[PDB]
JSON list of C-alpha atoms and ligand atoms in Angstrom, two decimals:
[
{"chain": "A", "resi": 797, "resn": "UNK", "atom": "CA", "xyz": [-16.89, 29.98, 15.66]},
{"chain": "A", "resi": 798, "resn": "UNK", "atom": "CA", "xyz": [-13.72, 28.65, 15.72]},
{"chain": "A", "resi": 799, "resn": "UNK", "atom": "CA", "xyz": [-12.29, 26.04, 12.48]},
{"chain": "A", "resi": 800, "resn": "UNK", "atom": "CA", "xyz": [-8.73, 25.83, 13.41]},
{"chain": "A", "resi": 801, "resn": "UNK", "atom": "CA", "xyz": [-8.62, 22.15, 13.59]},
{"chain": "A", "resi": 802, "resn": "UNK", "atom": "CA", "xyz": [-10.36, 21.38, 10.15]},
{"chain": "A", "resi": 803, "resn": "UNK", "atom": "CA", "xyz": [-8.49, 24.07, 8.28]},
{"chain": "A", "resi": 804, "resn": "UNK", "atom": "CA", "xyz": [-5.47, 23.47, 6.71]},
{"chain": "A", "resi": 805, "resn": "UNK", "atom": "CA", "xyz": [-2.60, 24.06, 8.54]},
{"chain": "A", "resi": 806, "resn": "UNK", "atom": "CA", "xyz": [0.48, 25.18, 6.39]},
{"chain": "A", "resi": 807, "resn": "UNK", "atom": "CA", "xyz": [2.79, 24.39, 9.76]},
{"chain": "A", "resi": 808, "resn": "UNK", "atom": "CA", "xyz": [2.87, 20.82, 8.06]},
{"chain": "A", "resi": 809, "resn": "UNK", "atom": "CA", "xyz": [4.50, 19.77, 4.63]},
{"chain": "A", "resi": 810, "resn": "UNK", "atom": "CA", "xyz": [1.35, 18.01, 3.49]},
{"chain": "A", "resi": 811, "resn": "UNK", "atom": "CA", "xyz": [-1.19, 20.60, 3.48]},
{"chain": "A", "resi": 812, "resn": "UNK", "atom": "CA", "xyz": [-3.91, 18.58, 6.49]},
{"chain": "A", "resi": 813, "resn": "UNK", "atom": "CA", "xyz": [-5.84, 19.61, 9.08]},
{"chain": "A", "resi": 814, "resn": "UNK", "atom": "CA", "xyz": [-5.27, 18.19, 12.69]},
{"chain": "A", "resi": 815, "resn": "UNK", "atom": "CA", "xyz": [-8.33, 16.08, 12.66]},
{"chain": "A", "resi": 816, "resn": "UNK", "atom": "CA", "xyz": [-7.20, 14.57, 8.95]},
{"chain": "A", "resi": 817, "resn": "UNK", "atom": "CA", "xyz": [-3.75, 13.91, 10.51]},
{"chain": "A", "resi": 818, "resn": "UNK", "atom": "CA", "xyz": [-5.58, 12.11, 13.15]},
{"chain": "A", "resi": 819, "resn": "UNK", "atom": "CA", "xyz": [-8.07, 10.37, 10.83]},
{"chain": "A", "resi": 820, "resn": "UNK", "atom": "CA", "xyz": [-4.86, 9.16, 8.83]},
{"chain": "A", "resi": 821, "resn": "UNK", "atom": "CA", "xyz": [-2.60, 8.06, 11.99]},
{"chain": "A", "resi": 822, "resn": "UNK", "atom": "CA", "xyz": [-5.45, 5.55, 12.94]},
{"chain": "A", "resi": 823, "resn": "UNK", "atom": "CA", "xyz": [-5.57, 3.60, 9.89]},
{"chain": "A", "resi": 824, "resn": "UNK", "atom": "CA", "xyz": [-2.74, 1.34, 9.16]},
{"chain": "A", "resi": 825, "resn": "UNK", "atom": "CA", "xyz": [-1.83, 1.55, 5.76]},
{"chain": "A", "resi": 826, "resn": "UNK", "atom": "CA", "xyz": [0.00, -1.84, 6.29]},
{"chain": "A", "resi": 827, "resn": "UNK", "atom": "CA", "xyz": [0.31, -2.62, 2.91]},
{"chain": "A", "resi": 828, "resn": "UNK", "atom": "CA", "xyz": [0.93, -0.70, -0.25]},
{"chain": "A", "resi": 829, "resn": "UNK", "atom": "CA", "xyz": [2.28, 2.19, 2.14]},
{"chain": "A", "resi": 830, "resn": "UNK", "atom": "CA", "xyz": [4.35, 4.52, 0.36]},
{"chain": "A", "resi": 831, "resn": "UNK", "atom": "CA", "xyz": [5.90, 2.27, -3.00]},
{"chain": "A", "resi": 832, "resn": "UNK", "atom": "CA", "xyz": [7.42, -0.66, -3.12]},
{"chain": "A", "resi": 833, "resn": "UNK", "atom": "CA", "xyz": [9.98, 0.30, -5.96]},
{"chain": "A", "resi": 834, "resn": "UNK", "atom": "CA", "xyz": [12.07, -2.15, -7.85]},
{"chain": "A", "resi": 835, "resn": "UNK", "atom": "CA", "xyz": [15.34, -2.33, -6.07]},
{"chain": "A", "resi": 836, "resn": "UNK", "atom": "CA", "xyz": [14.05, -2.14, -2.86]},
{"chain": "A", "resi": 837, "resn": "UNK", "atom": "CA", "xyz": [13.02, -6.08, -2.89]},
{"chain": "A", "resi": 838, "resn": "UNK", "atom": "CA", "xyz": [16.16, -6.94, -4.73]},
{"chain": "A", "resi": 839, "resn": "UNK", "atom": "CA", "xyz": [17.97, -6.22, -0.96]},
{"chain": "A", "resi": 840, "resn": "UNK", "atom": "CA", "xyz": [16.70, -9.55, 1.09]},
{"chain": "A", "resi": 841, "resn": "UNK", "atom": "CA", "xyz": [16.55, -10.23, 4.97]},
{"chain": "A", "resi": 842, "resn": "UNK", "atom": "CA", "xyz": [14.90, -12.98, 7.05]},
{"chain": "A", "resi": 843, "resn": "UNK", "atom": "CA", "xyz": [11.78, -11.41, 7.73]},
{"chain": "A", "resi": 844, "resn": "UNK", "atom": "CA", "xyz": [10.15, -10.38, 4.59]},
{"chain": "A", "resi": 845, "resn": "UNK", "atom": "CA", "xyz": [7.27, -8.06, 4.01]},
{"chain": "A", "resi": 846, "resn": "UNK", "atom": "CA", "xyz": [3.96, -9.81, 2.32]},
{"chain": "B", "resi": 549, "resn": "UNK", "atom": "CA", "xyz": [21.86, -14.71, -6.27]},
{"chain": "B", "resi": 550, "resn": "UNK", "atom": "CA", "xyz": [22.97, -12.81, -3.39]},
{"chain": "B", "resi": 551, "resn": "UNK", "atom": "CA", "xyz": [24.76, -13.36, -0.36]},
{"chain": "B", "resi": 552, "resn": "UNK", "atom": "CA", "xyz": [22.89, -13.82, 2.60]},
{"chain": "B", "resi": 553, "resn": "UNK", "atom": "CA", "xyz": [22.57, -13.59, 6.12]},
{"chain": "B", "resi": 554, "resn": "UNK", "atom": "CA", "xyz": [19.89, -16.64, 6.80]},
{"chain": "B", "resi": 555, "resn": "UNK", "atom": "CA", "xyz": [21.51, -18.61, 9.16]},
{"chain": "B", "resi": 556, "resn": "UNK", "atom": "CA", "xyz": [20.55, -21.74, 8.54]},
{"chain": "B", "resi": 557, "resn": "UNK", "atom": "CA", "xyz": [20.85, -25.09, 10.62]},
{"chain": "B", "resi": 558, "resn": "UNK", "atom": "CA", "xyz": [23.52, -27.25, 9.74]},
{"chain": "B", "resi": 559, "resn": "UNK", "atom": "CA", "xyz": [20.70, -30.14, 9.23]},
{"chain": "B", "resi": 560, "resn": "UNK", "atom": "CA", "xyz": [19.29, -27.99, 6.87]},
{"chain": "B", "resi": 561, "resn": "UNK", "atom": "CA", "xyz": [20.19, -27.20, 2.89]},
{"chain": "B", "resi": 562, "resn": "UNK", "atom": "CA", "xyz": [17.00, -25.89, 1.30]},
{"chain": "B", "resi": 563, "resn": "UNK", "atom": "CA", "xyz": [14.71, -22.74, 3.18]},
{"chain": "B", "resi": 564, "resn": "UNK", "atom": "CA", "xyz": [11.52, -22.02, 2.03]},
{"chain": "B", "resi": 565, "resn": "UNK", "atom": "CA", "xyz": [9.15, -18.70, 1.42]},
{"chain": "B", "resi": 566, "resn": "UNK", "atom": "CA", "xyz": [5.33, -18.74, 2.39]},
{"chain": "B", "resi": 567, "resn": "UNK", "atom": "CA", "xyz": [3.90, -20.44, -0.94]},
{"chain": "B", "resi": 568, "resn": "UNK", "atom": "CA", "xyz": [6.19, -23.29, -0.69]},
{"chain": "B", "resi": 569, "resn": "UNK", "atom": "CA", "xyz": [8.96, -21.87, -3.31]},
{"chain": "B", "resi": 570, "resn": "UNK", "atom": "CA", "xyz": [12.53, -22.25, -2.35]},
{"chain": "B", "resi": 571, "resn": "UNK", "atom": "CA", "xyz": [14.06, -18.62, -2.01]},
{"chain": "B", "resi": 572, "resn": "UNK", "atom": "CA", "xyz": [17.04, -19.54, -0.24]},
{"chain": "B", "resi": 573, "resn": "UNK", "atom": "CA", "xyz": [19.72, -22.46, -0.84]},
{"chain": "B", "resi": 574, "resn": "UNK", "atom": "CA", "xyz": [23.08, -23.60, 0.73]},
{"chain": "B", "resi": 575, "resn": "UNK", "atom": "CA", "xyz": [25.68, -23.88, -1.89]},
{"chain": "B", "resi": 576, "resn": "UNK", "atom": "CA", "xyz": [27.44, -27.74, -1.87]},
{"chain": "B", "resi": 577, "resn": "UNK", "atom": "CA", "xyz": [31.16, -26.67, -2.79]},
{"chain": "B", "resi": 578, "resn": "UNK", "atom": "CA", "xyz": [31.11, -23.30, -0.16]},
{"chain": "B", "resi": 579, "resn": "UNK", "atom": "CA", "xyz": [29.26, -24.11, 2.73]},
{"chain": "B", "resi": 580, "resn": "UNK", "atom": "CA", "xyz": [27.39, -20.58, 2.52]},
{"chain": "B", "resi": 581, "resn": "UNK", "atom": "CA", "xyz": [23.57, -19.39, 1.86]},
{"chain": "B", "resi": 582, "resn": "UNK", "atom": "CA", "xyz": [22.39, -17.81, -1.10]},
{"chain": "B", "resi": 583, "resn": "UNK", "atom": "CA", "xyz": [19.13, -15.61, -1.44]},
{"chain": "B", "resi": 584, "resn": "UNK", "atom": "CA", "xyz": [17.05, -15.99, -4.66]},
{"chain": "B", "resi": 585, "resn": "UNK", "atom": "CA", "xyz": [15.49, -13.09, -6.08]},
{"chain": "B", "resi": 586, "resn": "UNK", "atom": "CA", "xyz": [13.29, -13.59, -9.17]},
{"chain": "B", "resi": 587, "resn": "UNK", "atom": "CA", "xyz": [14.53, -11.36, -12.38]},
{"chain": "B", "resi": 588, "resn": "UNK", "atom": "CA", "xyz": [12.71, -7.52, -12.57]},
{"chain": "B", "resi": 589, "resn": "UNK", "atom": "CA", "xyz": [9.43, -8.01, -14.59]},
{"chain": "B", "resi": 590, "resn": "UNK", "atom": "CA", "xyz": [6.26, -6.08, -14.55]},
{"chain": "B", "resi": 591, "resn": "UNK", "atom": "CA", "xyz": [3.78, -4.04, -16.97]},
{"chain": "B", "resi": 592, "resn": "UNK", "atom": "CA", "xyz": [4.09, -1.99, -20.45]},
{"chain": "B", "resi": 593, "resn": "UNK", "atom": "CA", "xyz": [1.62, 0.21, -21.03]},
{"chain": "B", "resi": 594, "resn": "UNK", "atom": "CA", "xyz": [1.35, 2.68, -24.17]},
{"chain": "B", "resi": 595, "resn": "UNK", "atom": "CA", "xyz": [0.58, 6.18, -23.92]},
{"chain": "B", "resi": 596, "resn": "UNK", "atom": "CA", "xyz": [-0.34, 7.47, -27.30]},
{"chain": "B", "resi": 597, "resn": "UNK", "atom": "CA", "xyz": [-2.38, 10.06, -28.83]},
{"chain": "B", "resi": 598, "resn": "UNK", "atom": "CA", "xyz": [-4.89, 9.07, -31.63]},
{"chain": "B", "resi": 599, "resn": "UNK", "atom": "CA", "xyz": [-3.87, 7.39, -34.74]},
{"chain": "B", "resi": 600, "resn": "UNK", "atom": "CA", "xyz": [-6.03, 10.07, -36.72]},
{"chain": "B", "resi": 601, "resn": "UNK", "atom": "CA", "xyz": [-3.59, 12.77, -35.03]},
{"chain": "B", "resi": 602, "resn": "UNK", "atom": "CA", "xyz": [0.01, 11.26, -34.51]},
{"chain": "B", "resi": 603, "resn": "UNK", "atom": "CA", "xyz": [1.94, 8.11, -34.87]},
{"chain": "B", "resi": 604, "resn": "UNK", "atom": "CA", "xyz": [4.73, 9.31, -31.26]},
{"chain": "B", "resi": 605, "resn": "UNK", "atom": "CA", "xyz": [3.96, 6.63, -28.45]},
{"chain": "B", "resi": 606, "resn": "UNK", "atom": "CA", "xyz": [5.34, 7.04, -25.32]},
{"chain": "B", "resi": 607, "resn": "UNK", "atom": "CA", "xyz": [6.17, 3.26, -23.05]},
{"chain": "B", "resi": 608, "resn": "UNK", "atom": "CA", "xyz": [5.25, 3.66, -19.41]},
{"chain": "B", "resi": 609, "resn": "UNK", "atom": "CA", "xyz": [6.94, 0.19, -17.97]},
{"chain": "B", "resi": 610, "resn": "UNK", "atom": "CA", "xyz": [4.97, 0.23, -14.44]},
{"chain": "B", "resi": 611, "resn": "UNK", "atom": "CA", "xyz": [6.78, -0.12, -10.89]},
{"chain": "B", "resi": 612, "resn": "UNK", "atom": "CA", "xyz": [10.11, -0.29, -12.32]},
{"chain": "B", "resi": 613, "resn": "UNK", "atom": "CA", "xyz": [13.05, 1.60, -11.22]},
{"chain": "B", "resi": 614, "resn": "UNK", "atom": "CA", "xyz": [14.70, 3.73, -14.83]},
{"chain": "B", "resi": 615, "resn": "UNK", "atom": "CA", "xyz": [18.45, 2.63, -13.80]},
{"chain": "B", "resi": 616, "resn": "UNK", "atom": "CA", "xyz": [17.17, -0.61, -14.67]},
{"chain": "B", "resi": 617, "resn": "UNK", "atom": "CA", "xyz": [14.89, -1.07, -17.21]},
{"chain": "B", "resi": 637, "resn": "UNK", "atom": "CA", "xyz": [16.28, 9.28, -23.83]},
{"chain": "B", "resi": 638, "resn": "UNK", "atom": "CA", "xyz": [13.40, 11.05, -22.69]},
{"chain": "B", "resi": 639, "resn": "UNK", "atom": "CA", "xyz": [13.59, 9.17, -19.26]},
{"chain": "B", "resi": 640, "resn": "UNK", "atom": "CA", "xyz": [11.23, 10.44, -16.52]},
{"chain": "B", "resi": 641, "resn": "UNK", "atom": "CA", "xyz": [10.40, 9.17, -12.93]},
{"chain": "B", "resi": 642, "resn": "UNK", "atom": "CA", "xyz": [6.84, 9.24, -12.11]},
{"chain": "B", "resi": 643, "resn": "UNK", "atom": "CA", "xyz": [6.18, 7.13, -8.79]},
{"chain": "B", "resi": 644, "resn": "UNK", "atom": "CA", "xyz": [3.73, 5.15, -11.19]},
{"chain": "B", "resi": 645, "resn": "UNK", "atom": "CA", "xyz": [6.71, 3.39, -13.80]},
{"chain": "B", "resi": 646, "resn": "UNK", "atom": "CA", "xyz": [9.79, 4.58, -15.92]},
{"chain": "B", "resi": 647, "resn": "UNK", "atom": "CA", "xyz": [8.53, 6.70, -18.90]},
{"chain": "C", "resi": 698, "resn": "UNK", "atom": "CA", "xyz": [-35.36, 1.14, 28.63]},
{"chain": "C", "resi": 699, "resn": "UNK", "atom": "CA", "xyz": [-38.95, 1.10, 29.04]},
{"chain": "C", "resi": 700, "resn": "UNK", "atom": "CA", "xyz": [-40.76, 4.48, 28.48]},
{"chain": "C", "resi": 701, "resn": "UNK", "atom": "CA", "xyz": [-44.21, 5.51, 28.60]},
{"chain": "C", "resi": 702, "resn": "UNK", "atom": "CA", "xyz": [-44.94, 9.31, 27.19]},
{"chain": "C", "resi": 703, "resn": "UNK", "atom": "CA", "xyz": [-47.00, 11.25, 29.55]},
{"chain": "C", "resi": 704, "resn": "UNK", "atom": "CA", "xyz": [-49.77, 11.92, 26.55]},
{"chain": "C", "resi": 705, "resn": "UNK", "atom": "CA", "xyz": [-53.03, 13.72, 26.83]},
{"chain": "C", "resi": 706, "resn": "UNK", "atom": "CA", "xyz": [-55.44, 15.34, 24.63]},
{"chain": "C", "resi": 707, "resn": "UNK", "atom": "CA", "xyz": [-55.01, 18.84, 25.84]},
{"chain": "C", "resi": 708, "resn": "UNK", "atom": "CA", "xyz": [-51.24, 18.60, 27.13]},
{"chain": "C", "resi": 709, "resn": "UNK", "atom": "CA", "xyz": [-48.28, 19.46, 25.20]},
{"chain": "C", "resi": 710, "resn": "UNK", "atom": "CA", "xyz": [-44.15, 19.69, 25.62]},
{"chain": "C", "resi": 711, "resn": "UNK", "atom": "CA", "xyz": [-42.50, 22.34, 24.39]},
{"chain": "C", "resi": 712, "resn": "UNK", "atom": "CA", "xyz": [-38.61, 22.54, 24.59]},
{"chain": "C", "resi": 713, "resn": "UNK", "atom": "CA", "xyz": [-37.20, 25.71, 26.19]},
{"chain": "C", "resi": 714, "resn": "UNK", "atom": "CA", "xyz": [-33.62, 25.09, 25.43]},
{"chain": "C", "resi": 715, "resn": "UNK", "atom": "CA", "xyz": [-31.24, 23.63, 22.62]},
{"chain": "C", "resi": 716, "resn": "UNK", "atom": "CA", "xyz": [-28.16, 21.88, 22.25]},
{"chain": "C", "resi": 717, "resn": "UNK", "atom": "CA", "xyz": [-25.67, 21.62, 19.25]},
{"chain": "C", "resi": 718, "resn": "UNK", "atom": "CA", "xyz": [-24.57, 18.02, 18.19]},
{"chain": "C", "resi": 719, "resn": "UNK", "atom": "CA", "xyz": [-21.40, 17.52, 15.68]},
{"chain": "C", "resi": 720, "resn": "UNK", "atom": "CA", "xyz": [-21.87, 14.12, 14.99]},
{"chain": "C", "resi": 721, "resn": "UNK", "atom": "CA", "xyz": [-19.09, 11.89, 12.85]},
{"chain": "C", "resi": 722, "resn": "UNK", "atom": "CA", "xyz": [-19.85, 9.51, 9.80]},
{"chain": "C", "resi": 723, "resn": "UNK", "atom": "CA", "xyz": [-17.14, 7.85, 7.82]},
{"chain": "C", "resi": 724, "resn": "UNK", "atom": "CA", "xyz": [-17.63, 6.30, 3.90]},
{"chain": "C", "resi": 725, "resn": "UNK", "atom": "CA", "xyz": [-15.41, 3.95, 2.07]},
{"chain": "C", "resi": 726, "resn": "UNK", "atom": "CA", "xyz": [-14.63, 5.83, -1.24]},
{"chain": "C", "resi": 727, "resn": "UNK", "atom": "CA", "xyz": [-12.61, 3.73, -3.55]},
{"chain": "C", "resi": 728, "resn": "UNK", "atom": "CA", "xyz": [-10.33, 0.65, -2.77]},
{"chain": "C", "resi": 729, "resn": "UNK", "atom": "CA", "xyz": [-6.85, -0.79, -3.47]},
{"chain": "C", "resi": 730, "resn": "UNK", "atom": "CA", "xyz": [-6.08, -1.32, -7.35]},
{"chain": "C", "resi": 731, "resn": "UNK", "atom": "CA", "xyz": [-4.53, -4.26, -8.08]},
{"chain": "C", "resi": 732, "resn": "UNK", "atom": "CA", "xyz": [-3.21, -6.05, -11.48]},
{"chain": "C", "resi": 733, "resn": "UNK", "atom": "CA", "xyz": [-2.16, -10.05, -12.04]},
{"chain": "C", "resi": 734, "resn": "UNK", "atom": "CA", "xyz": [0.57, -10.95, -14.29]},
{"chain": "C", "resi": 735, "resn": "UNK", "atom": "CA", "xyz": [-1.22, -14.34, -15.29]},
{"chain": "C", "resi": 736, "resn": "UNK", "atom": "CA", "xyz": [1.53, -15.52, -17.04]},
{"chain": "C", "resi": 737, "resn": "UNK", "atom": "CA", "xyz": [4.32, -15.15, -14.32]},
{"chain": "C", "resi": 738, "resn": "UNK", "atom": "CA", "xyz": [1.33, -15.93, -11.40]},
{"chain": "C", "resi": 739, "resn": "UNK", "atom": "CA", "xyz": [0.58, -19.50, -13.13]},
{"chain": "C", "resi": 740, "resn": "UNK", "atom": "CA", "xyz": [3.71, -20.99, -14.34]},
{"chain": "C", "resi": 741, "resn": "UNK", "atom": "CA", "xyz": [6.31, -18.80, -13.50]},
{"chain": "C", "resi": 742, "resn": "UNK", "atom": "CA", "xyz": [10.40, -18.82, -14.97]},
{"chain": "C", "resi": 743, "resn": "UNK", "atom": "CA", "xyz": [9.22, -21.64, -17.04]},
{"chain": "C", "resi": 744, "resn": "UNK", "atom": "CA", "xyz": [8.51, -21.04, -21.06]},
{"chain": "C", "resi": 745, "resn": "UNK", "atom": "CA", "xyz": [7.26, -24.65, -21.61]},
{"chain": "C", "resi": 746, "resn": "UNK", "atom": "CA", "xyz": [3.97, -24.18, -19.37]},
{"chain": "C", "resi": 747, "resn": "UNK", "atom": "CA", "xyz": [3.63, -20.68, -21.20]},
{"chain": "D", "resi": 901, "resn": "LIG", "atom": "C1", "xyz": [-9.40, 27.45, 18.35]},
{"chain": "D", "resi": 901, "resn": "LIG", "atom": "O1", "xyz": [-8.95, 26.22, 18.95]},
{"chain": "D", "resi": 901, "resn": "LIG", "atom": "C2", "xyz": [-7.52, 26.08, 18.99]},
{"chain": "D", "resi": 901, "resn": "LIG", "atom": "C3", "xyz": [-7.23, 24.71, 19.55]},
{"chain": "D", "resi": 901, "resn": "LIG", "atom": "O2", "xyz": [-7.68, 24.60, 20.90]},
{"chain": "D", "resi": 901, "resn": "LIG", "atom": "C4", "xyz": [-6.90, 27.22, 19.81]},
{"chain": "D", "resi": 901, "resn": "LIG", "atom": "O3", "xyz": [-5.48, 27.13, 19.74]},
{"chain": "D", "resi": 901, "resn": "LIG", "atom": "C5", "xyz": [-4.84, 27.06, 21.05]},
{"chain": "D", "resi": 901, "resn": "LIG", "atom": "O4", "xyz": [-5.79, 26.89, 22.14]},
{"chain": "D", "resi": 901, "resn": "LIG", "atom": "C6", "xyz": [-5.19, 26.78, 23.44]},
{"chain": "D", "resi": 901, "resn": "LIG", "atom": "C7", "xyz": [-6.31, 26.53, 24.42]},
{"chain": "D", "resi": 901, "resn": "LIG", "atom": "O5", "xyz": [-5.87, 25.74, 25.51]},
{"chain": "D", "resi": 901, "resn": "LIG", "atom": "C8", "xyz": [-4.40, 28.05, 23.74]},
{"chain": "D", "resi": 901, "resn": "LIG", "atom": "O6", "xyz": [-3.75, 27.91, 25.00]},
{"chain": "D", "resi": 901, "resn": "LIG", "atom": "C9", "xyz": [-3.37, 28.31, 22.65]},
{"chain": "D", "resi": 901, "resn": "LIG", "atom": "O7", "xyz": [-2.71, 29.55, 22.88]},
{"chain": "D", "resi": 901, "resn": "LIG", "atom": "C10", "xyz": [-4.03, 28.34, 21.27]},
{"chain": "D", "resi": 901, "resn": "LIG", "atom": "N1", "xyz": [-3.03, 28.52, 20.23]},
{"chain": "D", "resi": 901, "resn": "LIG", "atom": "C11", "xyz": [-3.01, 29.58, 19.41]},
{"chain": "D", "resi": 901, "resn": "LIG", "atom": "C12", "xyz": [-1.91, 29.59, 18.39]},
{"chain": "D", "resi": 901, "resn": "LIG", "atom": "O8", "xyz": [-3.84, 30.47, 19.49]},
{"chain": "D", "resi": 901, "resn": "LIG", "atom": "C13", "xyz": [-7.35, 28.57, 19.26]},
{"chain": "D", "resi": 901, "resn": "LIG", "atom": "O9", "xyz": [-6.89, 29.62, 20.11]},
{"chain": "D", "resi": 901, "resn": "LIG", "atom": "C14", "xyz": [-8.87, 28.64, 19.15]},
{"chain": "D", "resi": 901, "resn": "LIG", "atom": "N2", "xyz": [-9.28, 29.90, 18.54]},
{"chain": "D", "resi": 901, "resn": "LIG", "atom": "C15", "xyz": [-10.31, 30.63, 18.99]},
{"chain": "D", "resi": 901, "resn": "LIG", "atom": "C16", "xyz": [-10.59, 31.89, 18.24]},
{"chain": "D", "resi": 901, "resn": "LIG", "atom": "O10", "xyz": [-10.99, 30.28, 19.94]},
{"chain": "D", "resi": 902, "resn": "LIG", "atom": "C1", "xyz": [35.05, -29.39, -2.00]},
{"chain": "D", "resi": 902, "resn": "LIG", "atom": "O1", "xyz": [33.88, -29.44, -1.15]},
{"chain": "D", "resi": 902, "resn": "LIG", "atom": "C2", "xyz": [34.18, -29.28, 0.25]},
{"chain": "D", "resi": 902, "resn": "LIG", "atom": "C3", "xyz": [32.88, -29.45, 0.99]},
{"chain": "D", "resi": 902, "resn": "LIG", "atom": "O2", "xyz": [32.02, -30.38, 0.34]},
{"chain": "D", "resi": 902, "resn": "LIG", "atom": "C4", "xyz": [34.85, -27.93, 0.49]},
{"chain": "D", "resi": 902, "resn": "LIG", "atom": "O3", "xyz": [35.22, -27.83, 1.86]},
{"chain": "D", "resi": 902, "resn": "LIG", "atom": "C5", "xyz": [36.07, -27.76, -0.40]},
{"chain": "D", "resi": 902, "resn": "LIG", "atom": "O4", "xyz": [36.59, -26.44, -0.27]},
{"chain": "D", "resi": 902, "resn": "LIG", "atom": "C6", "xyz": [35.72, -28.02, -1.86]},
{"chain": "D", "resi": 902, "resn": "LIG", "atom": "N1", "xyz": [36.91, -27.93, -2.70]},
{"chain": "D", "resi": 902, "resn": "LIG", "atom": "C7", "xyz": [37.03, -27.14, -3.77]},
{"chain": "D", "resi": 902, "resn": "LIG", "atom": "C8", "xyz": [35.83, -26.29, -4.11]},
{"chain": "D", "resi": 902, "resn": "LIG", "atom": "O5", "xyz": [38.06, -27.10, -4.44]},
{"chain": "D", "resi": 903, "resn": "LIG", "atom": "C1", "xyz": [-59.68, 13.01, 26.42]},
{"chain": "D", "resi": 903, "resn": "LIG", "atom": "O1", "xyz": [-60.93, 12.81, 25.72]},
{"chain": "D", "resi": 903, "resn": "LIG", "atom": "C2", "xyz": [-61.76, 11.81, 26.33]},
{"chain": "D", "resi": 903, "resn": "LIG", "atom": "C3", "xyz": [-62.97, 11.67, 25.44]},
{"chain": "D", "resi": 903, "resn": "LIG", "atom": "O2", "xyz": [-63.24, 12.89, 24.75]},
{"chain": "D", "resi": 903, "resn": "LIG", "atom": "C4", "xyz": [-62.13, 12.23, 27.76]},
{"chain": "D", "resi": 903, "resn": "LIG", "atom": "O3", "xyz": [-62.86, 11.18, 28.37]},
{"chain": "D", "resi": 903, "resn": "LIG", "atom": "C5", "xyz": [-60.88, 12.53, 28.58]},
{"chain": "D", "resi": 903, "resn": "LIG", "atom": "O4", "xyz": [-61.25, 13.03, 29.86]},
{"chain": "D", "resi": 903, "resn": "LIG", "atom": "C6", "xyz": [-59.97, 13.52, 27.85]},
{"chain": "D", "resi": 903, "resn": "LIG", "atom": "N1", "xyz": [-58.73, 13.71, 28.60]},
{"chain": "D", "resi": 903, "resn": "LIG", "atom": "C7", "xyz": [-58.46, 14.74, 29.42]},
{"chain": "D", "resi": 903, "resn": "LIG", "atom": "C8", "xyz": [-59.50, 15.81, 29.53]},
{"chain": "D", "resi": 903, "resn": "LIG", "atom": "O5", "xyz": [-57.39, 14.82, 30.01]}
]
């Protein structure tokens, strides 16, 4: 039997299998992706995220 | 108040953000456009032990960079 | 689509072969946490309304 693609694979920094990494790139995050720290909203342009 | 690259209409002196709140205004004396940006803010929260153990309480002040808010850690959750 | 089975009181179907079937099913787990600054939501810069 063959588990290559749902066991870890330590090829990438954030220790997820291939189907993961695909389960992950299909949902948009769209909000609250990564952290909106202070700072970051204190720079301003037109367009501005919700 | 910051300096801003909104470049507004000359018909035009106050611009608006989605919940009808002025966040950007053209200054009467220099004809240039300022961005507001509301004041940092957010949550304190109190990490203690019990009161029948200890009296040391640590301040977690949440979403808030530490340059500006001794034992001053970053945790991706608030400076503590 | 319509189907009638072929039954009868002395006639039986037996499989002779198998197949193996890896079927996907996805849960919701826990959602976005969220917290309102009442204060700052309702009046906002103003000490007044607080
Ligand atoms: C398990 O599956 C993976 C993914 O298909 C295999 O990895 C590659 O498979 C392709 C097949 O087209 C080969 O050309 C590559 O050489 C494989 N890469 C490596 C690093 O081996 C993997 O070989 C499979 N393992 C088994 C035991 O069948
Ligand atoms: C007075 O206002 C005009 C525009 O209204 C501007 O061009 C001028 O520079 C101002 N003079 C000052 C600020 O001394
Ligand atoms: C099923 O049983 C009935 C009554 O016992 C009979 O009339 C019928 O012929 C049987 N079916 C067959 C033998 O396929």
């Amino acid at each position: 039997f063959n588990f290559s693609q749902i066991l870890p694979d330590p090829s990438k920094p954030s220790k997820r299998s291939f189907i993961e990494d695909l389960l992950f790139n299909k949902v948009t995050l769209a909000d609250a992706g990564f952290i909106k720290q202070y700072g970051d909203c204190l720079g301003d342009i037109a367009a501005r995220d919700l | 108040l910051t300096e801003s690259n909104k470049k507004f209409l000359p018909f035009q002196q106050f611009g608006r953000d989605i919940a009808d709140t002025t966040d950007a205004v053209r200054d009467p004396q220099t004809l240039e456009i300022l961005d507001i940006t509301p004041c940092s803010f957010g949550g304190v929260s109190v990490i203690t032990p019990g009161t029948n153990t200890s009296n040391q309480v640590a301040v977690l002040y949440q979403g808030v960079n530490c340059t500006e808010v001794s034992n001053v850690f970053q945790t991706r959750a608030g400076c503590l | 689509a319509e189907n009638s089975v072929a039954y009868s009181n002395n006639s039986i179907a037996i499989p002779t072969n198998f197949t193996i079937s890896v079927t996907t099913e996805i849960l919701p787990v826990s959602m976005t946490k969220t917290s309102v600054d009442c204060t700052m939501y309702i009046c906002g810069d103003s000490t007044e309304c607080s």
